[PDB]
């Protein structure tokens, strides 16, 4: 099964005659399912995603300032005004300056002064709101058919699950069926949050955090920017004029602050499809509809050999790849025991029967030696094949 390649693996073993079992699922890891007389099943959480969530807000983390205007009044003559001030697109500021005869004024004192400049966002991050209804899981699950490493990619069953679906099961040929009732209703609390999109990078962030950000912001409708005071700053006036200061691109700062968020990813195949990284899911699983397919076939021990020798997995069980070329479709036996006398099968067999289903093809097998060390068997007679293992 595809699952052999996962780094983090753990075993759930069902009680005998438990027609259901269940598993808890996480993208970093996989589960393997054992039952006393059933083909073993491996389960893995695949992509969790949304397509086209709705725009909440846009935030300009950088902007540029130009056309800067200034106007001024002598202290007695009351408050200054400007034409460009009339519209928010020019992000105005108003204040007072010294004036006096030394700057051509008629009287000494504080005089009114005003400045504007057209404001344009250079680069903006966008926010999109989580509809829990639109949460789509995908899940990967596969029986221990003993299929070749390669065939894993084609046997693998890929299923999608969502708040609109309870189970959408599948069948494994001869091995029968398992029903899968996933926890689509319950697994995450993200309704309180936005997906944050930067340039080719993205995050999930709570609505409060985002709404609390001081940078200038705009509705999902793209209405004129609301709060340029947090990006644009002004010198205290020199008597003639004010220099206007653009703060730098903030994305470095913001991307630093975002370091605590969970990451999110764009799909190239559909730019509106967003994939959540590191989610959790759980499911209830029926095992009773499973079948050990191969029981009909013979035992021949007919000069089998390794295509690839036994080796330790990433997860402490051992695996091997083998064929009976020629021979017949057959289900050769496997045991691990205390001694070459093989008195007790002291450890656990992890896939129960091979099937040499065609005279040209190989099989892949898995076993769980007992703690300490133990001896492995396949085949019969002096012509049987063997190795040694630790725990």
């Amino acid at each position: 099964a595809h699952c052999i390649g996962i780094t983090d693996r753990d075993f759930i073993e069902g009680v005998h005659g438990g027609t259901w079992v269940s598993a808890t699922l996480e993208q970093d890891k996989c589960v393997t399912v054992m039952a006393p007389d059933k083909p073993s099943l491996d389960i893995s959480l695949e992509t969790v995603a949304i397509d086209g969530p709705a725009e909440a807000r846009k935030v300009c983390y950088s902007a540029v300032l130009t056309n800067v205007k200034i106007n001024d009044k002598c202290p007695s003559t009351g408050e200054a005004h400007l034409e460009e001030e009339n519209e928010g697109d020019n992000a105005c500021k108003r204040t007072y300056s010294d004036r006096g005869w030394g700057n051509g004024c008629g009287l000494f004192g504080k005089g009114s002064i005003v400045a504007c400049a057209k404001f344009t966002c250079a680069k903006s991050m966008s926010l999109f709101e989580v509809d829990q209804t639109k949460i789509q899981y995908v899940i990967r699950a596969q029986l221990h058919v003993g299929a070749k490493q390669e065939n894993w990619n084609t046997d693998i069953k890929t299923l999608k699950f969502d708040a609109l679906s309870g189970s959408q099961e599948a069948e494994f040929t001869g091995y029968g069926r398992a029903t899968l009732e996933c926890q689509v209703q319950t697994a995450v609390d993200f309704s309180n949050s936005y997906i944050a999109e930067m340039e080719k990078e993205s995050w999930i962030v709570d609505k409060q955090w985002a709404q609390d950000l001081t940078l200038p912001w705009q509705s999902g409708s793209g209405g004129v920017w609301r709060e340029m005071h947090h990006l644009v700053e002004f010198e205290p006036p020199h008597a003639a004029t004010i220099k206007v200061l653009a703060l730098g691109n903030q994305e470095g700062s913001l991307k630093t602050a975002l370091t605590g968020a969970m990451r999110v990813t764009k799909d190239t195949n559909n730019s509106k499809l967003y994939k959540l990284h590191g989610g959790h899911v759980a499911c209830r699983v029926k095992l009773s509809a499973l079948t050990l397919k191969g029981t009909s076939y013979k035992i021949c021990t007919d000069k089998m050999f390794f295509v690839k020798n036994p080796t330790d997995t990433g997860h402490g069980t051992v695996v091997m790849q083998v064929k009976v070329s020629k021979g017949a479709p057959c289900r050769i036996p496997v045991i691990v025991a205390d001694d070459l006398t093989a008195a007790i099968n002291k450890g656990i067999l992890v896939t129960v029967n091979p099937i040499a289903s065609t005279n040209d093809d190989e099989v892949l097998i898995e076993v769980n030696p007992p703690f300490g060390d133990s001896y492995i068997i396949v085949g019969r007679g002096d012509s049987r094949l063997t190795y040694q293992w630790h725990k």
Partner: antibody
């Protein structure tokens, strides 16, 4: 009625000095900003100077120091005094008011009939 | 420094003909452009003080349109006051500056 009427243009010695003037009428002159402009004899218009409703002057680098505006809003009269005059200029001169919002950054509203410089 | 370049210089058109004239500036001007006429031998006149803005008393047959950097007049009918020199003038940036002018005539 926005009649605006320049005065004082004429002949001058190179390196000499002159004070131009203009009279406004018909509006609350203090509120507006104003500008001086010179029509070159080859017909290039060129900005000479401008003055805020706050008496804040503005000049192109080409006349920095040599030229200056001042205004007398007790009598609705504009002045433009200038020195080290050079035959780089022998234009017709005109002046104009700006916005009623009163700022240097305005288009020109209306222009006076003008008076012309010459240098020899 | 700012520079303006009006495209024509010497067009001719019939009485009541429709004509467009246009100018590109050396950078952004954010439509702080104006359009001006000199009728020959007498003091200039003001036509449009931002694109899409008729000045007072200017007849509706004058018009003009703009962008960041390139702008135009269009005249729907060159009535007999057409004859004269037309100038653009930018005023966003304090060294205010003028187009070349452009003449018009009948002969």
């Amino acid at each position: 009625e926005v009649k605006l009427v320049e005065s004082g243009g004429g002949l001058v010695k190179p390196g000499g000095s002159l004070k131009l003037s203009c009279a406004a009428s018909g509006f609350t002159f203090t509120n507006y900003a104003m500008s001086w402009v010179r029509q070159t004899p080859e017909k290039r218009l060129e900005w000479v100077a401008s003055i805020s409703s706050g008496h804040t002057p503005y000049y192109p680098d080409s006349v920095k120091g040599r030229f200056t505006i001042s205004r007398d809003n007790a009598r609705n009269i504009l002045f433009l005094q200038m020195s080290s005059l050079r035959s780089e200029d022998t234009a017709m001169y005109y002046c104009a008011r700006g916005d009623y919002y009163g700022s240097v950054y305005s288009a020109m509203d209306y222009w006076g009939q003008g008076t012309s410089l010459t240098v020899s | 420094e700012i520079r303006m370049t009006q495209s024509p210089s010497s067009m001719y058109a019939s009485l009541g003909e429709r004509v467009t004239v246009t100018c590109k500036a050396s950078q952004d001007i954010n439509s702080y452009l104006s359009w001006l006429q000199q009728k020959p031998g007498k003091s200039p006149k003001t036509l449009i003080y931002r694109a899409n803005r008729l000045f007072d008393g200017v007849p509706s047959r004058f018009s003009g349109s703009g962008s960041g950097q390139d702008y135009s007049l269009t005249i729907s009918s060159l009535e007999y006051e057409d004859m004269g020199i037309f100038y653009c003038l930018q005023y966003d940036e304090f060294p205010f500056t003028f187009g070349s002018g452009t003449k018009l005539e009948l002969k």
